[PDB]
Every structure is written in C-alpha cells, then in structure tokens.
Amino acid sequence: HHSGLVKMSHPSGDVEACMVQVTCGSMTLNGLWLDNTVWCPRHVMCPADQLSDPNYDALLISMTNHSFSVQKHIGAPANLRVVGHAMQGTLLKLTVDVANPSTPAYTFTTVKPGAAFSVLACYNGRPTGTFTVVMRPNYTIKGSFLCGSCGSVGYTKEGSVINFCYMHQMELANGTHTGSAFDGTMYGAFMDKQVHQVQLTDKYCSVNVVAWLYAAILNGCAWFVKPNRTSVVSFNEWALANQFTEFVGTQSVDMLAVKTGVAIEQLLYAIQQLYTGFQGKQILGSTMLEDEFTPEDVNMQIMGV
Amino acid sequence: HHSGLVKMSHPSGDVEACMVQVTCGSMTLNGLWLDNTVWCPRHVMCPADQLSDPNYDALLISMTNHSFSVQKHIGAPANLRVVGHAMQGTLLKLTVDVANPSTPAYTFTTVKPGAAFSVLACYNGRPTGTFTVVMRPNYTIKGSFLCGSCGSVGYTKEGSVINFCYMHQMELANGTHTGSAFDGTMYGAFMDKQVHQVQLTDKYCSVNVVAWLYAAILNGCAWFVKPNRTSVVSFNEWALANQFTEFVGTQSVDMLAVKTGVAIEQLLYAIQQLYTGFQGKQILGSTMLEDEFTPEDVNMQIMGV
Ligand SMILES: *[C@H](O)[C@H](C[C@@H]1CCNC1=O)NC(=O)[C@H](CC(C)C)NC(=O)OC[C@H]1CC(=O)N(C[C@@H]2C[C@@H]3C=C[C@H]2C3)C1
Ligand SMILES: *[C@H](O)[C@H](C[C@@H]1CCNC1=O)NC(=O)[C@H](CC(C)C)NC(=O)OC[C@H]1CC(=O)N(C[C@@H]2C[C@@H]3C=C[C@H]2C3)C1
C-alpha cells in the first residue's frame, strides 16, 4: 500500500523568473530580483580564498556600485546595472535600474521549525532543481546543495502570493544546510563563516509525527491506536527528556482528529510507545517515526483540503 | 548525518506554460498544449457517471470539434478553438487554431522501470505542485493525485529539451497510480477503466538499491561492505526468487564504483545479506533498503556530476 504522500513542492515558474547571477571579484552566486532590488548572500564580496572568517563590514566599505555585475540568463537575457548597494545582516540588497517585469506578488516571512517550504536550487543564476524540506528544530534543513548554490531561495505560497523565507548560505559538517531569512538574520545561532561552529541538537518534530500517524490511519493502518491517552502537558514533559519538540496543536491537526475519530492524545501515547520500538511492525512502510510531513501536507494530499 | 539526497524535480516553469483545461460534456481535466496540439486523456469524453468501463470508440464517433472546450488560465488567459480531434490509444489529440507561443523544445519518450521523472500535478488546468517519482517495476508510480488530476504530466529534461513521458490516468486500489505514454499506450498491462484489474507484483529496483549503498559509502557509511562478492549472473538468479529486479549495470553506476573503490559485486553481496536483515544497524538513517534514488541522482546530487 502507498500512503498517497510525496514530497510536494510548489510549481517553480514564478520564482524561476526572478533568479539572477551576481558576480563580485572572484565570486559568483545567485540572487533574487524583485522590483528594483536584487538580494544575494553577502559573502559574494569575499575573495574566494578568504571565506574562512570574513570581516564583512570592511568588505562592504571597499565596494562601489560597479563592483557588482548582475545578469539574467533564461527567459529574458539581460545585464542589470547596479545603481545602489547596501548590507542587511547576512544579505546584500543591490538596487538595479530595471524593475523585474515578472515580479510576483510577494512577502518576506520567517519559517518556523517543522514547517515545510519549497527550494529552487540554482547555479550561476540558472535554476536546476526543486525540492521541499522542513525546517529542523535546530534551524538547519536537510537539503541538496553544492558549490555555487548560494543565493538559491526557499518559499511558500498562499494563493498567488509568494512568501520568501530562505536564502541559502552554507553547509554544516553533518551534511545539513542553513541560510538567511530576508531580514538578513541567519536561521538559528549560525553565522556566515566557514570556521567551527557549535551545532544545536536536532529533535523529532512531534506535530509532524502526529500528522504522519494520522496519515497512516487515513490509509487504514491503525494497529498502534489504543484507548490509552497521554495529555499534551504530560507528553510535552516527556518530550523534553526524549529529544522531541513540544506538541502545539493547530486547526490542521484538529481536522485530522475529526476525520479519523482518533484523538490527539491517543497518538501522543502511541508516539511514546513507538519511540521505544515498533516491535517488528511497520507504519506506512517504515519502522521508524517520520516527521518530514506536516499536518497541512496530510490535509492537502490525502483529504484534498 | 544527512546524506545530501533529496527528491529533486526539474524546475517546472517551462511545462507550466503548456498546461490547459479541457472540458467535454460533464468532464473536465488537464491537457498539454504543444504547437497546435492539445493532448489529454480520452476519458474526458466519458459522461462523469459512466467511467466504469467505457466504449471509447463509440464516444469518439459521437463528438465534434466544438464538443471540446480548451482554456488556458495562468500567464496568458485564452480560449483555444478546437479545429480537429483524434484518438491515439488512451489519449486524445486535439488540434487548436493557435500555436502555443511558449512551446519548449521537446520530445516524447517512454520511461523505464527504476528511472525517475518529474510530475507537474494540475487541477482545472492550473499547476498546483511538483514532485518526482521512479517508475516501479510493475508500471505504477507512488504519486499524489486526487480527483481532477488527470492530464497532469511527467517529464525528464536533457539540456533545454523536455522529454514528456507520462500523462496521468488513474489510481489503483493499493493507492499507486498509472498513466499513458504520449504514444497513447498505458504503462504496463493497465487499461483506462475503473473496474477490477489484475495488478502486477512490485519488486525492489536493484540498480537503485546499489546506487543508494554507494551514496552511503560516499557519506562515510560502509559497515556493510565486505570483501565478499556476488557475480551479476549469480545475483540476477537470486533476484528472480526474491522480488528484486535483475541488475543491469550502466556507466553511471560504474562512475560510483570508481569514485568509492567498491565493486558492484561487493554491493550485490551486501544486498543479499541486508535483505535478510540489518541486524539493528542503519544505513543513511534507514533500516530497510531504499530504491527510490537512481545512480544519476547520486552522481548529480553528491558527486556534482
Ligand atoms: C555557497 O554557494 C556555498 C554553499 C555550500 C557549498 C557546499 N554545499 C553548500 O551548501 N557556501 C559556502 O561555501 C560557505 C561559505 C561561508 C558561509 C562563507 N561555506 C560552507 O558551506 O562551508 C562548507 C562546510 C563543510 C564543512 O564541513 N564545514 C564545517 C567547517 C570545517 C571545519 C569543521 C567545522 C568547520 C571547520 C564548512
Ligand atoms: C482523473 O482525474 C482520475 C485520477 C484519480 C482520481 C483519484 N486519484 C487519481 O489518481 N482518474 C480516475 O478517476 C479514473 C478514471 C478511469 C480510468 C476511467 N479512475 C480511477 O482512478 O478510479 C479510482 C480507483 C480507486 C479504486 O480503488 N479503484 C479500483 C477499482 C475499485 C474496485 C476494486 C478494484 C477496481 C474495482 C478505482
């Protein structure tokens, strides 16, 4: 049996039309062209052989507008003249003299741990792939990024409005990734430097595990459901000692409880038992808990909400 | 540790610009507009209450050109006048009086079991999501499709050329999906009818399992590698008795063997042992074999080829 769940990304066309290549000195990466502004990671200013631990304030002072070259490649090829530049946090804000005629309706938002978003991976200003990730509790993502991918963007969509939430910056030693929000802050405690940094400990996202167990029930797989219940308060105390996030319910989870007739508290109890072992049984083809699907994923993909 | 593998789809913009809505009678679904042709599933001709087991030859005779309404919604809204119609296998070929000005360079191809492709899921001629799947050995895909999704398309890309390989038709009782190639044939032994159909038995895709074990080695995870080797001939005999596809090597797998220094035959032996059980150990976070990543995925995402 197949659960009917896949890793679903938004269609990428609207964002593809905003990607550009930004070159400065010996560095080239990707940027996002919206209206008369191009956003890109500030380490484009760094000499390619001094990425270890840069002094970005001094680099910024050394640049002028024609220190930067902005090129759009696909769709409508163009060189975009830079007429202003500024730094906000770990991003550069370049002002260009042409407004992107394909600028979508958009906002900037910050994504929260456990929430999903779509990524458009780009190299040299050319989109190459798209994938979806959940923001981990330790403010990394389990992505797929190589050299040249910085400036690739992550986003969600509400209606036709694109909510940009992530601009790629770096890989960590354990193979995970992190980046900036468009307010210029890095997610988590990370800084845009290549030297050793403490990494926070990851955790299972409890609300997503609950969503996945509801997905199992909706597929006729409920062997783990018992009358036994664990309160949210009691579960959250247990979670703190067992590398789980605390559970915070939402309307999306409530809709799953109503559809299946299985209470949240029954699945909180199930999680505590399953964490100790599946005892040879599988759930939706798996012998470990799955936290990479959201309640919204389950509502949309299975219940067609 | 994260392997650096995600489910990677192609950027969807070029295909989004080809999607249209096709209406006929009481049915509406999606179609693909290339040049002066619109492709769509033939069951658009079926009255919505007679999808059980249609006589499509009789339905086709009963239609005329203005039995069909073709509408493009996003980007460049339009009603496309139908000036011809024909049936090929399980698809309709509608001729319209306007050439799609956004027609990409394209081909039609058939995808083979174990190979990956990208899907653009659409409803009412509007793209809603994108995801990637491997064609299963029993000629189903483990997708995410709801009512209204037929006519959604699957494709691969070589350079800028889009190779269309799949047009969605139906869901099976076990939750998997299947569809047509653009020559009009259904994948596998399936027919575009809603009544009971024998489903062929699925299998592990051995070449993809080998790719995944190489991905593990490339991430420093090689506890399952031993000097022991199983020949391709011997493995393929074993596979026939154990619900594995026969292994057929490719240049992409050879590149992984060269990079890691681990021979294909060492991993064929490992698979035979792992199939019997992982004995409490994990590989790239998993306690079962993974066959949803291709050798090309591993080369591109990890080795940057
Ligand atoms: C931007 O294109 C690029 C994206 C990277 C390339 C590889 N995959 C990606 O996602 N970003 C960088 O190269 C970035 C630049 C700095 C922020 C200025 N640096 C980066 O990602 O470094 C790669 C890491 C690999 C690794 O193990 N570390 C951790 C270091 C090594 C040593 C142990 C811990 C610290 C010190 C750096
Ligand atoms: C086209 O939009 C649509 C896509 C479907 C809807 C649900 N998810 C999808 O992928 N295709 C159809 O509705 C399709 C139409 C026929 C090909 C004319 N029929 C279809 O997909 O039927 C849904 C299946 C669910 C199910 O269990 N079966 C198997 C039947 C039921 C009974 C046991 C086995 C046979 C007889 C049909």
XYZ file of C-alpha atoms and ligand atoms in Angstrom:
684
model
C 0.000 0.000 0.000
C 1.121 3.539 -0.832
C 0.094 6.304 1.541
C -0.528 8.863 -1.172
C 2.144 11.154 0.301
C 5.018 12.568 -1.724
C 7.397 15.413 -1.115
C 5.360 18.108 -2.868
C 6.886 21.430 -3.889
C 5.126 24.439 -5.349
C 5.438 24.922 -9.105
C 8.597 26.974 -9.530
C 7.908 29.065 -12.633
C 7.118 32.321 -10.835
C 10.352 32.144 -8.827
C 12.480 30.982 -11.782
C 11.683 34.294 -13.458
C 13.291 36.136 -10.502
C 16.653 34.367 -10.364
C 19.806 36.166 -11.470
C 23.562 35.691 -11.324
C 25.575 38.080 -9.143
C 29.345 38.403 -9.635
C 31.747 40.386 -7.465
C 35.503 39.996 -7.690
C 36.344 36.298 -7.745
C 32.938 35.123 -6.511
C 29.735 34.325 -8.352
C 26.444 33.136 -6.880
C 22.688 33.543 -7.279
C 20.406 36.425 -6.421
C 16.693 37.180 -6.299
C 15.397 40.061 -8.439
C 12.167 41.654 -7.183
C 11.086 45.116 -8.311
C 14.327 47.183 -8.472
C 16.141 45.112 -5.832
C 18.500 42.119 -6.076
C 19.070 40.147 -2.868
C 22.095 37.903 -2.530
C 24.408 36.494 0.160
C 26.984 38.973 1.333
C 29.869 36.536 1.001
C 29.807 37.270 -2.699
C 32.043 40.173 -1.575
C 34.614 37.825 -0.095
C 37.695 36.852 -2.111
C 37.121 33.209 -2.983
C 40.227 32.261 -0.948
C 39.234 34.095 2.266
C 35.829 32.594 3.065
C 37.153 31.289 6.407
C 36.032 34.133 8.698
C 35.364 37.365 6.783
C 35.141 40.953 8.023
C 32.076 41.904 6.021
C 31.903 45.486 7.288
C 35.322 46.219 5.788
C 34.458 44.406 2.566
C 31.279 46.475 2.150
C 33.178 49.754 2.514
C 35.609 48.671 -0.216
C 32.871 48.110 -2.826
C 31.220 50.524 -5.236
C 28.197 50.017 -7.464
C 30.182 48.688 -10.398
C 31.960 46.212 -8.117
C 28.859 44.095 -8.790
C 27.634 42.538 -12.035
C 24.065 41.225 -12.212
C 22.971 39.060 -15.157
C 19.652 37.431 -16.007
C 20.067 34.362 -18.237
C 16.873 32.475 -19.070
C 13.652 33.865 -20.475
C 14.811 37.457 -20.982
C 18.624 37.713 -21.053
C 19.942 40.945 -19.557
C 22.740 42.739 -17.736
C 21.207 44.715 -14.849
C 23.078 47.894 -13.959
C 23.691 48.230 -10.211
C 22.887 51.784 -9.027
C 22.946 51.184 -5.271
C 24.154 48.730 -2.686
C 23.578 48.054 0.984
C 24.049 45.272 3.518
C 21.320 43.937 5.773
C 22.546 41.250 8.117
C 23.969 38.436 6.022
C 22.417 39.666 2.755
C 23.244 42.334 0.238
C 20.490 44.497 -1.163
C 21.524 45.707 -4.628
C 19.447 48.345 -6.346
C 19.253 47.924 -10.116
C 17.939 50.322 -12.710
C 15.318 47.978 -14.190
C 12.274 46.638 -12.376
C 11.740 42.915 -12.846
C 8.697 42.818 -15.176
C 7.927 39.337 -13.833
C 7.908 40.303 -10.165
C 5.199 38.225 -8.471
C 3.023 39.323 -5.606
C 5.262 38.577 -2.653
C 6.071 38.896 1.019
C 9.015 38.062 3.223
C 8.404 35.738 6.157
C 10.380 33.564 8.564
C 9.652 29.865 8.603
C 9.311 28.001 11.912
C 10.704 24.590 12.880
C 8.611 21.757 11.495
C 7.111 23.876 8.747
C 7.717 22.927 5.119
C 8.881 25.093 2.268
C 9.948 24.762 -1.349
C 13.507 25.379 -2.556
C 14.620 26.357 -6.059
C 18.246 25.226 -6.365
C 20.184 27.376 -8.817
C 23.717 27.586 -10.122
C 25.175 30.581 -11.960
C 21.745 32.190 -11.982
C 20.171 29.166 -13.707
C 17.539 27.055 -11.897
C 18.455 23.394 -11.854
C 16.103 21.644 -9.438
C 13.357 21.982 -6.923
C 12.668 20.141 -3.690
C 10.849 20.608 -0.385
C 12.234 20.500 3.153
C 11.005 21.063 6.681
C 12.905 23.492 8.865
C 14.530 21.315 11.530
C 14.208 22.149 15.245
C 17.943 23.057 15.223
C 17.405 25.536 12.322
C 19.076 23.504 9.625
C 17.482 21.864 6.589
C 18.326 18.517 5.046
C 18.886 19.873 1.557
C 20.917 19.111 -1.551
C 23.280 21.982 -2.335
C 26.726 22.083 -3.967
C 29.329 24.757 -4.582
C 27.715 27.671 -6.402
C 24.267 27.122 -4.903
C 24.269 30.059 -2.510
C 21.521 32.502 -3.171
C 19.110 29.659 -4.000
C 15.780 30.559 -2.423
C 13.116 28.904 -0.322
C 9.489 29.995 -0.287
C 5.889 29.107 0.468
C 2.790 30.271 -1.365
C -0.614 31.482 -0.219
C -2.851 31.902 -3.223
C -0.730 33.660 -5.814
C 1.458 35.411 -3.190
C 4.979 34.017 -2.816
C 6.305 34.187 0.757
C 10.078 34.114 0.507
C 11.584 32.637 3.623
C 15.109 31.327 2.930
C 18.264 32.246 1.062
C 20.915 29.561 1.043
C 24.278 30.235 2.700
C 26.193 27.188 3.866
C 26.635 23.512 4.616
C 27.442 22.134 8.045
C 29.832 19.318 8.864
C 26.973 16.827 9.272
C 25.753 17.491 5.720
C 22.781 19.696 6.643
C 22.315 23.229 5.404
C 21.339 26.655 6.589
C 20.697 30.126 5.308
C 19.172 33.536 5.897
C 15.754 34.999 6.180
C 15.206 38.092 4.058
C 15.512 40.304 7.123
C 19.181 39.288 6.888
C 19.262 37.102 10.012
C 20.654 33.591 9.786
C 18.348 30.878 10.977
C 19.407 29.622 14.379
C 22.637 30.646 16.054
C 24.721 30.220 12.873
C 26.996 32.851 11.341
C 28.065 33.089 7.682
C 31.620 31.887 8.272
C 33.435 28.687 7.436
C 35.139 28.044 10.786
C 33.963 25.725 13.533
C 30.511 26.485 14.917
C 28.534 24.704 17.615
C 25.526 22.977 16.106
C 22.364 22.676 18.136
C 20.911 19.245 18.664
C 18.111 18.175 16.343
C 14.834 16.667 17.597
C 11.816 14.865 16.234
C 9.043 17.298 15.322
C 6.154 15.931 17.360
C 3.376 17.700 15.463
C 4.644 16.222 12.190
C 4.889 12.748 13.712
C 1.278 13.093 14.791
C 0.387 14.151 11.237
C 2.090 11.055 9.844
C 0.273 8.729 12.257
C -2.996 10.323 11.139
C -1.935 9.730 7.542
C -1.479 6.076 8.469
C -4.988 5.872 9.955
C -6.445 7.539 6.859
C -4.797 4.710 4.875
C -6.369 2.026 7.065
C -3.250 1.461 9.215
C -4.146 1.891 12.891
C -2.629 -1.055 14.790
C -0.817 1.419 17.066
C -4.057 3.160 18.138
C -5.208 2.147 21.633
C -7.722 3.618 24.081
C -4.715 4.834 26.096
C -4.177 8.600 26.074
C -1.381 10.940 27.129
C -2.234 14.564 27.829
C -0.473 17.327 25.900
C 1.015 18.626 29.161
C 2.317 15.161 30.107
C 3.608 14.452 26.602
C 5.463 17.759 26.495
C 7.229 16.965 29.749
C 8.244 13.595 28.312
C 9.320 15.211 25.049
C 11.854 17.455 26.779
C 13.645 14.368 28.088
C 13.465 12.376 24.836
C 14.599 14.702 22.023
C 11.096 15.575 20.824
C 9.728 19.063 20.276
C 6.831 20.040 22.459
C 3.472 19.472 20.791
C 1.379 22.535 19.963
C -1.922 21.720 18.361
C -3.367 23.541 15.369
C -6.604 23.627 13.401
C -4.949 21.453 10.766
C -4.298 18.702 13.296
C -7.814 19.098 14.700
C -9.248 18.459 11.233
C -7.347 15.162 11.117
C -8.654 14.163 14.553
C -12.215 14.870 13.447
C -11.887 12.964 10.165
C -10.390 9.843 11.769
C -12.168 9.981 15.104
C -8.820 9.404 16.829
C -7.855 11.883 19.492
C -4.531 13.712 19.509
C -3.924 12.331 22.990
C -4.213 8.746 21.715
C -1.427 9.426 19.227
C 0.740 11.146 21.832
C 0.557 7.919 23.800
C 1.318 5.925 20.647
C 4.419 8.009 19.948
C 5.800 7.320 23.429
C 5.351 3.589 22.833
C 6.625 3.603 19.249
C 9.698 5.593 20.281
C 10.625 2.556 22.394
C 10.287 0.298 19.352
C 7.938 -0.810 16.587
C 8.378 -4.479 17.597
C 8.707 -5.780 14.059
C 5.705 -3.874 12.708
C 5.661 -1.185 10.046
C 3.708 2.030 9.620
C 3.267 3.234 6.030
C 6.215 1.065 5.046
C 8.507 2.388 7.799
C 9.999 1.045 11.022
C 10.850 4.479 12.439
C 8.873 7.619 13.148
C 8.532 10.064 10.255
C 8.467 13.819 10.918
C 9.058 15.245 7.421
C 5.336 15.616 6.595
C 3.170 18.360 8.045
C -0.475 18.337 9.083
C -1.132 20.604 6.106
C 0.539 18.067 3.792
C -1.757 15.340 5.063
C -4.871 17.513 4.788
C -3.999 18.597 1.231
C -2.581 15.447 -0.279
C -4.866 12.852 1.293
C -8.047 14.662 2.357
C -7.900 17.053 -0.594
C -8.347 20.110 1.661
C 24.358 12.823 9.350
C 22.368 13.798 6.258
C 23.201 12.037 3.012
C 22.740 15.097 0.840
C 19.962 13.358 -1.113
C 16.524 14.867 -1.630
C 13.746 14.094 -4.039
C 14.791 16.544 -6.758
C 12.423 17.589 -9.534
C 13.191 19.731 -12.553
C 12.086 23.362 -12.373
C 8.537 23.332 -13.706
C 8.168 26.731 -15.375
C 8.562 25.533 -18.963
C 5.875 22.871 -18.502
C 3.533 25.144 -16.514
C 3.271 27.323 -19.612
C 1.886 24.324 -21.561
C -0.930 23.263 -19.239
C -4.547 23.865 -20.221
C -8.017 22.861 -19.081
C -10.052 20.589 -21.364
C -13.828 20.293 -20.895
C -16.151 17.901 -22.709
C -19.709 17.268 -21.594
C -19.731 16.712 -17.842
C -15.983 16.112 -17.533
C -13.085 18.494 -17.069
C -9.399 17.637 -16.762
C -5.961 18.879 -17.796
C -4.234 18.870 -21.152
C -0.814 19.637 -22.597
C -0.591 22.324 -25.298
C 2.398 21.984 -27.644
C 2.479 23.711 -31.025
C -1.103 23.409 -32.399
C -1.903 20.219 -30.466
C -3.566 19.603 -27.084
C -3.089 16.141 -25.569
C -5.443 14.904 -22.880
C -6.854 11.635 -21.503
C -9.637 10.231 -23.611
C -11.941 9.651 -20.656
C -12.730 13.337 -20.798
C -15.288 12.102 -23.372
C -16.971 9.842 -20.846
C -20.092 11.023 -19.011
C -18.922 11.571 -15.449
C -21.315 8.820 -14.268
C -20.157 6.129 -16.737
C -16.421 5.912 -16.043
C -16.784 2.236 -15.055
C -15.893 0.584 -18.381
C -16.306 2.957 -21.340
C -16.632 2.218 -25.056
C -14.272 4.928 -26.236
C -14.640 4.150 -29.941
C -18.355 4.954 -29.778
C -17.739 8.055 -27.676
C -15.214 9.382 -30.211
C -17.671 8.998 -33.093
C -20.280 10.999 -31.160
C -18.022 14.053 -30.718
C -17.409 17.024 -32.989
C -14.818 19.776 -32.713
C -16.984 22.042 -30.592
C -17.730 19.161 -28.217
C -14.428 20.236 -26.638
C -13.525 23.466 -24.848
C -9.855 24.254 -24.214
C -8.891 27.094 -21.856
C -5.518 28.445 -20.764
C -5.674 30.164 -17.361
C -2.362 31.440 -15.997
C 0.165 33.655 -17.727
C -1.813 34.313 -20.913
C -5.537 33.591 -20.438
C -7.216 32.230 -23.561
C -9.943 30.070 -25.063
C -8.359 27.829 -27.719
C -10.669 26.930 -30.592
C -10.628 23.202 -31.392
C -10.401 22.638 -35.174
C -9.626 18.913 -35.171
C -9.773 15.864 -32.970
C -8.390 12.350 -32.998
C -7.770 9.470 -30.611
C -4.445 7.716 -30.179
C -4.605 4.868 -27.712
C -5.755 6.269 -24.389
C -5.142 9.913 -25.359
C -6.980 12.484 -27.397
C -5.066 14.685 -29.789
C -6.966 17.963 -30.226
C -5.863 20.380 -32.902
C -6.291 24.030 -31.939
C -6.032 27.104 -34.103
C -3.292 28.832 -32.087
C 0.253 27.573 -31.641
C 1.478 27.713 -28.057
C 3.979 30.616 -28.166
C 5.718 29.077 -25.145
C 6.213 25.636 -26.661
C 9.574 24.335 -25.418
C 11.958 22.151 -27.340
C 10.525 18.720 -26.660
C 10.367 15.022 -27.395
C 8.137 12.156 -26.382
C 9.770 9.173 -24.703
C 8.793 6.163 -22.603
C 10.293 5.854 -19.158
C 11.640 2.504 -17.933
C 11.219 0.871 -14.517
C 13.575 2.337 -11.943
C 14.044 5.570 -13.848
C 12.988 8.847 -12.245
C 10.875 11.613 -13.680
C 9.247 14.853 -12.592
C 5.477 15.329 -12.336
C 3.545 18.600 -12.527
C 0.256 17.987 -10.704
C -2.523 20.196 -12.042
C -6.198 20.726 -11.381
C -8.584 22.541 -13.723
C -5.646 23.486 -15.922
C -3.810 25.148 -13.013
C -0.494 23.715 -11.742
C -0.577 23.053 -8.027
C 2.505 21.013 -7.149
C 5.535 19.204 -8.385
C 7.195 16.005 -7.235
C 9.456 13.245 -8.546
C 8.813 9.503 -8.738
C 10.529 6.411 -10.068
C 8.595 4.165 -12.410
C 8.003 0.979 -10.414
C 8.827 -2.458 -11.866
C 5.047 -3.135 -12.045
C 4.488 0.081 -14.095
C 2.818 2.102 -11.388
C 4.132 5.200 -9.619
C 3.754 6.128 -5.974
C 2.274 9.548 -6.636
C -0.091 12.038 -5.030
C -3.120 12.622 -7.249
C -6.749 13.475 -6.448
C -9.935 13.821 -8.458
C -9.354 16.269 -11.300
C -5.651 15.493 -11.647
C -5.836 13.511 -14.870
C -3.851 15.025 -17.649
C -1.084 16.020 -15.213
C 2.210 15.310 -16.955
C 5.512 13.653 -16.178
C 8.760 14.525 -17.919
C 12.544 14.465 -17.849
C 14.921 17.044 -19.270
C 18.138 16.804 -21.260
C 19.630 20.246 -21.614
C 16.735 22.506 -22.516
C 14.752 19.693 -24.217
C 11.746 18.412 -22.266
C 11.107 14.682 -22.744
C 7.458 14.104 -21.928
C 6.915 10.589 -20.704
C 3.688 10.352 -18.666
C 0.117 11.591 -18.674
C -1.851 10.729 -15.571
C -4.909 8.478 -15.857
C -5.872 6.583 -12.727
C -5.365 5.336 -9.198
C -5.201 1.678 -8.248
C -6.733 0.045 -5.199
C -3.381 -0.024 -3.381
C -3.019 3.760 -3.696
C -0.472 3.759 -6.535
C -1.016 5.467 -9.854
C -0.595 4.924 -13.544
C -0.966 6.706 -16.830
C -0.127 6.856 -20.514
C 2.888 7.485 -22.616
C 2.351 10.018 -25.384
C 2.155 7.236 -27.954
C -1.187 6.557 -26.246
C -0.210 3.258 -24.601
C -0.832 2.772 -20.901
C 2.184 1.800 -18.888
C 2.074 -1.872 -18.005
C -0.929 -4.072 -18.658
C -3.430 -1.485 -17.356
C -6.462 -0.184 -19.241
C -8.222 3.162 -18.699
C -11.261 1.686 -16.961
C -12.469 1.737 -13.388
C -13.338 -1.953 -12.971
C -11.198 -4.631 -11.373
C -7.794 -5.144 -12.973
C -5.012 -7.541 -12.038
C -2.039 -5.630 -10.689
C 1.436 -6.954 -11.307
C 3.665 -7.550 -8.334
C 6.145 -4.820 -7.455
C 9.845 -5.506 -6.801
C 12.870 -3.743 -5.405
C 14.835 -1.982 -8.139
C 18.279 -3.495 -7.673
C 20.207 -0.854 -9.610
C 18.697 1.877 -7.426
C 19.494 -0.053 -4.250
C 23.083 -0.283 -5.429
C 23.046 3.477 -6.064
C 21.818 4.104 -2.525
C 24.511 1.886 -0.988
C 27.093 3.857 -2.968
C 25.531 7.049 -1.631
C 26.053 5.630 1.853
C 29.738 4.920 1.162
C 30.197 8.428 -0.242
C 28.855 9.671 3.121
C 31.348 7.575 5.086
C 28.882 4.754 5.880
C 30.335 1.431 4.719
C 29.870 -1.076 7.561
C 28.026 -3.387 5.144
C 30.958 -3.529 2.681
C 32.933 -6.787 2.900
C 35.483 -8.451 0.619
C 32.716 -10.912 -0.314
C 31.386 -10.571 -3.862
C 28.401 -11.925 -5.774
C 28.570 -12.002 -9.558
C 25.928 -10.191 -11.605
C 24.831 -13.523 -13.099
C 24.505 -15.120 -9.644
C 22.765 -12.081 -8.165
C 20.256 -11.994 -11.009
C 19.341 -15.621 -10.420
C 18.824 -14.835 -6.736
C 16.836 -11.715 -7.589
C 14.248 -13.678 -9.564
C 13.440 -15.690 -6.441
C 13.432 -12.727 -4.033
C 11.320 -9.975 -5.635
C 14.266 -7.958 -6.948
C 14.724 -6.729 -10.500
C 17.700 -8.111 -12.331
C 20.730 -5.836 -12.147
C 21.923 -4.230 -15.378
C 24.963 -2.061 -14.954
C 25.397 1.361 -16.520
C 28.114 3.976 -16.899
C 26.502 5.924 -14.069
C 26.943 3.013 -11.676
C 30.490 2.453 -12.937
C 31.354 6.050 -12.042
C 30.219 5.373 -8.471
C 32.329 2.206 -8.286
C 35.383 4.127 -9.463
C 34.865 7.019 -7.038
C 34.401 4.781 -3.985
C 36.699 1.944 -4.974
C 33.936 -0.515 -4.059
C 32.976 -3.018 -6.700
C 29.400 -3.538 -7.855
C 29.766 -7.204 -6.950
C 30.575 -6.319 -3.327
C 27.293 -4.428 -3.074
C 25.333 -7.220 -4.746
C 26.570 -9.462 -1.960
C 25.680 -6.798 0.611
C 22.129 -6.546 -0.721
C 21.604 -10.299 -0.342
C 22.725 -10.056 3.287
C 20.831 -6.852 4.073
C 17.650 -8.284 2.556
C 17.809 -10.883 5.343
C 18.050 -8.121 7.947
C 20.024 -5.062 9.017
C 20.579 -6.560 12.499
C 19.883 -3.350 14.377
C 22.098 -1.174 12.179
C 21.065 1.727 9.980
C 22.166 2.931 6.565
C 21.659 6.647 5.878
C 19.115 6.717 8.687
C 17.148 3.706 7.401
C 16.609 0.106 8.476
C 15.320 -1.055 5.082
C 16.672 -0.955 1.557
C 15.933 2.206 -0.424
C 15.312 2.011 -4.182
C 13.785 5.439 -4.905
C 17.119 7.084 -5.832
C 18.876 6.460 -9.124
C 22.569 6.235 -9.947
C 22.155 9.524 -11.801
C 20.666 11.117 -8.664
C 23.691 10.063 -6.649
C 26.157 11.249 -9.295
C 24.424 14.637 -9.625
C 23.459 15.433 -6.069
C 26.501 14.099 -4.226
C 29.360 13.961 -6.742
C 28.154 17.067 -8.570
C 28.347 15.329 -11.972
C 27.579 28.853 -1.333
O 27.438 28.540 -2.705
C 28.149 27.687 -0.546
C 27.159 26.526 -0.453
C 27.796 25.267 0.128
C 28.890 24.637 -0.725
C 28.821 23.166 -0.364
N 27.403 22.996 -0.064
C 26.807 24.131 0.294
O 25.654 24.241 0.715
N 28.530 28.123 0.799
C 29.779 28.063 1.264
O 30.715 27.590 0.619
C 30.009 28.579 2.686
C 30.634 29.971 2.666
C 30.800 30.632 4.035
C 29.470 30.785 4.750
C 31.489 31.980 3.896
N 30.820 27.643 3.442
C 30.417 26.367 3.570
O 29.300 25.960 3.326
O 31.420 25.596 4.039
C 31.286 24.178 3.830
C 31.340 23.467 5.157
C 31.750 21.988 5.068
C 32.248 21.668 6.455
O 32.492 20.556 6.915
N 32.361 22.853 7.119
C 32.491 22.998 8.569
C 33.845 23.595 8.932
C 35.017 22.661 8.600
C 35.784 22.574 9.946
C 34.897 21.811 10.886
C 33.860 22.578 11.170
C 34.049 23.877 10.451
C 35.576 23.994 10.486
C 32.307 24.009 6.208
C -8.530 11.519 -13.267
O -8.584 12.843 -12.774
C -8.679 10.499 -12.152
C -7.463 10.487 -11.227
C -7.694 9.641 -9.978
C -8.767 10.161 -9.029
C -8.317 9.656 -7.672
N -6.865 9.650 -7.818
C -6.471 9.562 -9.087
O -5.310 9.414 -9.475
N -8.886 9.163 -12.716
C -9.984 8.436 -12.496
O -10.900 8.806 -11.762
C -10.049 7.067 -13.177
C -10.951 7.113 -14.408
C -10.997 5.827 -15.232
C -9.622 5.436 -15.741
C -11.973 5.968 -16.388
N -10.484 6.051 -12.236
C -9.800 5.867 -11.095
O -8.687 6.297 -10.871
O -10.508 5.107 -10.233
C -10.114 5.175 -8.850
C -9.764 3.794 -8.359
C -9.856 3.622 -6.834
C -10.006 2.133 -6.649
O -9.914 1.506 -5.596
N -10.244 1.601 -7.881
C -10.129 0.184 -8.224
C -11.488 -0.390 -8.608
C -12.472 -0.428 -7.430
C -12.937 -1.908 -7.414
C -11.747 -2.717 -6.987
C -10.865 -2.681 -7.970
C -11.460 -1.874 -9.081
C -12.942 -2.223 -8.915
C -10.611 2.630 -8.869
